[PDB]
């Protein structure tokens, strides 16, 4: 190309000036590059200074290369080909420069061009890079491998495709030749490259797997950390996808991995420790570790101590050895269950009472990690350990306090199942004290743990409500941002746990002002709305009428957030390159709070909905690609159907075909909420529902006959079928005997409430229309009627009329023989209410 003296002098001057210590000269050199950056000829100069101008010192050539790199990562679309191709050529021709800094800049450039640009726009990068691998000069081969490694790392899923034409079928078998390479760096590159293609089950590798595994074993003896690390991660990944090939060497592999897990180089050890995590998921786990489990447990427990650096940092963190070890112990406890306890109790004995806080802390962690797997076996020891943990909550080391909060929360079920005065009461008391700890990590540990306890305890925390609130509100004053969010979650769970008991003027008065205060201080773009909003959702449901003085602004903001989100997606959908897509959680949370408002306020939401476009917006949410949006909108639909149907009725003809298309059990909560909604609309429509039954019934019967479908979906499906039958017995009546079995099984287990009442009314009217539909499975109906404790009188006589009716057809003889099959409670219950 064409380097000129004047141009070169100006750019070299500018590069020197960009390296000036003066701050003002920096800002003006920066704006000068801002202007120059869009001119392709300038880029020609930048690479020219990098690769050709030996006269200039290295930081200048490299800075030129890096400025060029930013220009590529921000303007490469606008590069013409003549300059691009000049850069490409000059880079590959300098991949092995004897200067390490220049070599690194050329490398970053190359990879950046393949990333920002296009892999299929540089068709001959990979082939050339591979051949450079064979070169003589060491640095040249190192540089090419470095480039390939980076390319495989970010372009992973693109070489395993037909975008190009299988370069892997050439690259992978070539890498495996360099595991035997004399230099540690190159070995590392080779392994790290291959490793990118294990979980993908990449053909080129899978049909060379034998040679791969062989070369990995040949490397086991290598003491160079980077190669050990990569071999370790090879074996870990291989364990997940090509198990068969490894079984015959499993003993030596476990021996190796157990050795590496104890390596003093923490980075090697972490990759080794992943082996136990993924091994514990394979069904062959018990069999493989029979010779090694006794050693594995203490090694894991020992790796669960905080590292020395973390101890110092936390004195005033992502995946590490300690977290990996704790996760591995958790899963192994779930595999081995009570069989683990003889391995674990001697370590706990020596750890839980130790005088060195780091050791004690690890012990409490261990005790928590195994809680799920070993719960049954640990019960005998909990009357001692729980009081001991409660004492540890006031340990003088913050990190002991916080881990104790968590471990106790892991035994919350057992605590709640015991007499409240022995464990629950003192635990809750010290948990509340902790919540107001001066240490921020303790605060958050305590809040999480208290929330978990709240979830488990429920009604058992009604007598200690005022004291709980006393503490939670005070936290408003002391908590900083990060922990106020956890507090909102704790309040939310409290409101869900205690329901209407929260509705007292004093509680409302202490709770609402700081919630509204933070509501007014956060903007519509702040993600921190999610916990506040979800907290408000729970509070509103609990407060009911008590929420009246607060609803209007809350309602208004929520509808708008749904609106602006929906408007954002539309705008992003039109011009994706200029308008970023919105975060739909704002919409999910806004809908959920509106659901809570409608459930809480009931009828009293009418004025707000009358003045709103909530249903026009709701129509758009119900059709969204995202399941959770639909799930929230069908929930809101059901709540508004109950609260103010007059505003919903106009939309039914549109809404129903959409509800009808969301009866898909693959999406449990969407299918559920649609089903519930359709039952609620049924009750309000009455016989006007007749045209809509065919779009839903066929599916509902299939869903109620589907094996392994959650209890709650089946209960709602049954209720809805009952409700449809109540308003339109003729359309649904006919299929009576295809659903009566599971309908009865499911509904026999729910409490006597309005929904159950309504659904049984439906099944009674339907029996009158198609009684033969019940004859064959009358045992199920008898049981379902016997499930009623306190039925309203009209429902009872309906029952008695069908029962008395049935006995009069099969005769006192078939009746007696049939009712012999009644368990005692059943026979007696129906003579007690129905005199059958």
């Amino acid at each position: 190309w064409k380097p000129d003296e004047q141009g070169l002098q100006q750019i070299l001057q500018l590069l020197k000036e960009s390296q000036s210590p003066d701050t003002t000269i920096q800002r003006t050199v920066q704006q000068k590059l801002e202007q120059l950056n869009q001119y392709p000829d300038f880029n020609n100069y930048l690479i020219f200074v990098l690769t050709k101008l030996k006269s200039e010192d290295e930081p200048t050539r490299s800075l030129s290369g890096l400025i060029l790199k930013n220009n590529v990562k921000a303007h490469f679309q606008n590069f013409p080909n003549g300059v691009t191709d000049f850069i490409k050529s000059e880079c590959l021709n300098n991949i092995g420069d004897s200067s390490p800094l220049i070599r690194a800049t050329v490398g970053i450039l190359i990879t950046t061009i393949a990333s920002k640009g296009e892999l299929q726009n540089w068709p001959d990068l990979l082939p050339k890079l591979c051949s450079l691998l064979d070169s003589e000069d060491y640095n040249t081969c190192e540089g090419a491998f470095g480039a390939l490694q980076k390319i495989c790392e970010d372009s992973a899923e693109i070489l395993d495709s037909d975008v190009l034409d299988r370069p892997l079928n050439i690259m992978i078998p070539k890498f495996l030749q360099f595991f035997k390479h004399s230099s540690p760096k190159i070995r590392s590159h080779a392994v790290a490259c291959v490793n990118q293609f294990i979980i993908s089950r990449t053909q080129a590798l899978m049909l060379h797997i034998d040679s791969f595994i062989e070369n990995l074993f040949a490397l086991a003896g290598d003491e160079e950390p980077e190669v050990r690390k990569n071999v370790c991660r090879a074996l870990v990944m291989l364990l997940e996808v090509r198990m068969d090939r490894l079984l015959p060497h499993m003993h030596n592999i476990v021996e190796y991995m157990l050795q590496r897990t104890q390596d003093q180089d923490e980075n090697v050890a972490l990759e080794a420790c992943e082996f136990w995590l993924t091994l514990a998921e394979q069904p062959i786990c018990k069999d493989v570790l029979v010779r090694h489990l006794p050693k594995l447990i203490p090694v894991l427990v020992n790796g669960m101590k905080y590292s020395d650096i973390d101890i110092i940092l936390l004195k005033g963190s992502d995946w590490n050895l300690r977290k990996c070890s704790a996760a591995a112990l958790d899963v192994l406890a779930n595999v081995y269950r009570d069989e683990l306890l003889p391995h674990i109790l001697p370590l706990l004995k020596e750890l839980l009472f130790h005088h060195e806080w780091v050791v004690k802390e690890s012990g409490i962690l261990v005790l928590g990690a195994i809680a799920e797997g070993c719960m049954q076996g640990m019960i005998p020891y909990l009357p001692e350990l729980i009081p001991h943990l409660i004492q540890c909550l006031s340990d003088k080391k913050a990190l002991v306090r916080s881990i104790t909060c968590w471990t106790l929360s892991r035994y919350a079920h057992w605590v709640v199942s015991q007499p409240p005065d022995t464990y629950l009461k003192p635990l809750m008391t010290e948990l509340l004290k902790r919540i107001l700890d001066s240490n921020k990590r303790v605060q958050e540990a305590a809040c999480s743990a208290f929330a978990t306890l709240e979830e488990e305890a429920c009604t058992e925390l009604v007598p200690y409500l005022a004291y709980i609130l006393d503490t939670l509100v005070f936290a408003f004053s002391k908590y900083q941002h990060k922990n106020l969010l956890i507090l909102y979650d704790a309040i939310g769970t409290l409101a869900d746990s205690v329901g209407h008991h929260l509705n007292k003027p004093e509680y409302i008065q202490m709770l609402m002002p700081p919630l509204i205060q933070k509501w007014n201080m956060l903007k519509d773009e702040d993600k921190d709305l999610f916990p506040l909003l979800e907290c408000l959702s729970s509070v509103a449901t609990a407060l009911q009428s008590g929420f009246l003085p607060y609803c209007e602004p809350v309602y208004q903001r929520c509808v708008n957030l749904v609106q602006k989100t929906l408007a954002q997606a539309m705008l992003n959908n039109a011009q994706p390159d200029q308008y970023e897509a919105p975060d739909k959680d704002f919409m999910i949370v806004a809908l959920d709070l509106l659901s809570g408002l409608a459930e809480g306020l009931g009828g009293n939401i009418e004025q707000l909905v009358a003045r709103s476009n909530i249903l026009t917006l709701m129509y758009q949410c119900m059709q969204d690609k995202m399941p959770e949006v639909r799930q929230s909108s069908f929930a809101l639909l059901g709540d508004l159907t109950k609260a103010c149907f007059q505003h919903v009725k106009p939309c039914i003809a549109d809404f129903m075909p959409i509800l009808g298309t969301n009866l898909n059990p693959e999406f449990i909560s969407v299918c559920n909420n649609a089903t519930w909604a359709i039952g609620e609309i049924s009750i309000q429509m009455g016989i006007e529902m007749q045209p809509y039954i065919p779009m839903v019934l066929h599916q509902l019967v299939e869903i109620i006959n589907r094996p392994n479908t959650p209890k709650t979906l089946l209960e709602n499906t049954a209720i809805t079928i009952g409700r449809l039958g109540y308003v339109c017995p003729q359309e649904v009546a006919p299929m009576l005997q295809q659903f009566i079995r599971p309908w009865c099984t499911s509904l026999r287990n729910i409490r006597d409430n309005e929904e159950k009442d309504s659904a049984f009314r439906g099944i009674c009217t339907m029996i009158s229309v198609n009684p033969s539909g019940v004859i064959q499975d009358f045992i199920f109906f008898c049981d379902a009627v016997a499930s009623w404790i306190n039925p309203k009188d009209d429902l009872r006589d309906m029952f008695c009329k069908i029962l008395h009716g049935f006995k009069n057809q099969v005769g006192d003889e078939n009746w007696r023989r049939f009712s012999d099959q009644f368990p005692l409670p059943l026979k007696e219950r129906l003579a007690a209410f129905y005199g059958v």
Binding site: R322, K323, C324, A326, A327, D330, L365, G368, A369, I403, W406, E444, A445, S448, A451, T452, E455, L485, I486, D489, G492, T493, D496, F530, P531, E534, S537, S538, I588, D592, S595, E599, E628, Q631, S632, A635, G638, D639, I668, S669, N672, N673, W676, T712, E715, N716, I719, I750, R751, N753, E755, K756
Partner: peptide, 20 residues
């Protein structure tokens, strides 16, 4: 029980800090 199925409990557990 019969009624809506919300994900508030699960969102609350998703923001609980992860020890490991």
């Amino acid at each position: 029980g019969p009624g809506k199925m919300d994900s508030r409990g699960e969102h609350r557990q998703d923001r609980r800090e992860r020890l490991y």
